[PDB]
């Protein structure tokens, strides 16, 4: 009779893109050094679907070079190890990602020059990726995020502009709409959904990286800020954990960013939880 439940950030960028998977335990403040990625990503985004980890797309600056990632990979808590996937069609280099009832959902992304709208969707039972209805603007940097099953997509970069306008997915349909815009343009944003709003904190919005953090309520079809994060981030990894969100590491346009914090709805104060065991930018994170 043990516990607990964890905050697993994969890959990202130091120096070069990177193949660690560490997982922070909240209720002790510790970390543990897991097994390495098959390849290291940075850009990449994580989710989890039915106990398991998955780490989709990103791309790898390293000493050989920058390859993009088509790649989907399958991490067992259990076992300590990875498992490759069915590859996406294209690859998709600061892609975001959604779950939607065990589907795992990929929008935007890049490969080279190419910015894409095509999102896809995979199926983990028959381990087989599907394309749906591209979005509505060509997006890298997006955050993405799920509420009452619907995809959100929100912020990024277009190939010219930085966005501040946020589209959705309507599965039923297989049709993207455009929702209210943000207040502030926002590529490379933390994105993720809690106590039915959907927050976007952070990221880069063509001048500078951001400290600001705004929520949109589906009831209202509005955004309002509320508490900003201490320090400024771009590209950070973003999650909720008990009623509580999250945000690991970013670049703030000196340092890479070993902060990690934790946004409580019911006070709107952000508070400083811990560090990374080192400084990092465009990890995959997820909780399970
Ligand atoms: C081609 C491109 C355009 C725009 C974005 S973007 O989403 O609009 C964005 C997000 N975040 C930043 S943080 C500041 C910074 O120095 N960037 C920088 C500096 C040197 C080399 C590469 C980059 C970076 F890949 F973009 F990071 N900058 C961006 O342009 C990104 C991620 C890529
Ligand atoms: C939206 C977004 C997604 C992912 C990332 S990211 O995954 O963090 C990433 C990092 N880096 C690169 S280019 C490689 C490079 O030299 N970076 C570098 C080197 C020195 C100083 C500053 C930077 C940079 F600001 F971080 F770019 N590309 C990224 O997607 C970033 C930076 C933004």
Redesign the pocket.
């Known amino acids: 009779p043990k516990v607990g439940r964890l905050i697993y950030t994969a890959g990202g960028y130091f120096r070069q893109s990177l193949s660690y998977l560490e997982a922070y335990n909240p209720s002790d403040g510790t970390w543990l050094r897991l097994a390495d990625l098959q390849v290291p990503r940075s850009?990449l985004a994580g989710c989890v679907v039915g106990g398991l980890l998955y780490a989709v797309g990103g791309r790898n600056n390293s000493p050989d070079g920058n390859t993009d990632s088509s790649a989907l990979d399958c991490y067992n808590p259990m076992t300590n190890q990875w498992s490759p996937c069915a590859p996406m069609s294209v690859p998709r280099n600061?892609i975001g990602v959604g779950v939607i009832d065990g589907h795992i959902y990929a929008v935007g992304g890049?490969h080279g020059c190419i910015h894409h709208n095509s999102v896809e969707r995979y199926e983990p039972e028959r381990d087989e990726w599907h394309l749906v209805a591209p979005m509505l603007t060509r997006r890298?940097?997006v955050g993405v995020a799920v509420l009452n099953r619907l995809l959100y997509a929100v912020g990024?970069?277009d190939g010219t502009n930085?966005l501040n306008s946020a589209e959705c997915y309507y599965p039923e349909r297989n049709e993207w709409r455009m929702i209210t815009a943000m207040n502030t343009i926002r590529?490379?944003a933390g994105v993720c959904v809690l106590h039915n709003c959907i927050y976007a904190a952070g990221?880069?919005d063509?001048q500078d990286?951001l400290n600001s953090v705004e929520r949109y309520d589906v009831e209202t079809e509005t955004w309002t800020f509320v508490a900003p994060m201490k320090h400024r981030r771009?590209?950070l990894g973003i999650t909720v954990h008990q009623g509580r969100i999250y945000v690991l590491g970013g670049?703030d346009?000196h340092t890479f960013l070993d902060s990690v914090e934790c946004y409580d709805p019911d006070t709107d104060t952000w508070s400083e939880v811990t560090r990374m065991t080192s400084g990092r930018?465009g990890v995959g994170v997820a909780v399970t």
Do not use: K, V
């Open positions: 850009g600061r890049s890298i940097g990024g970069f930085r590529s490379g990221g880069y063509g990286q771009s590209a670049y346009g930018s």
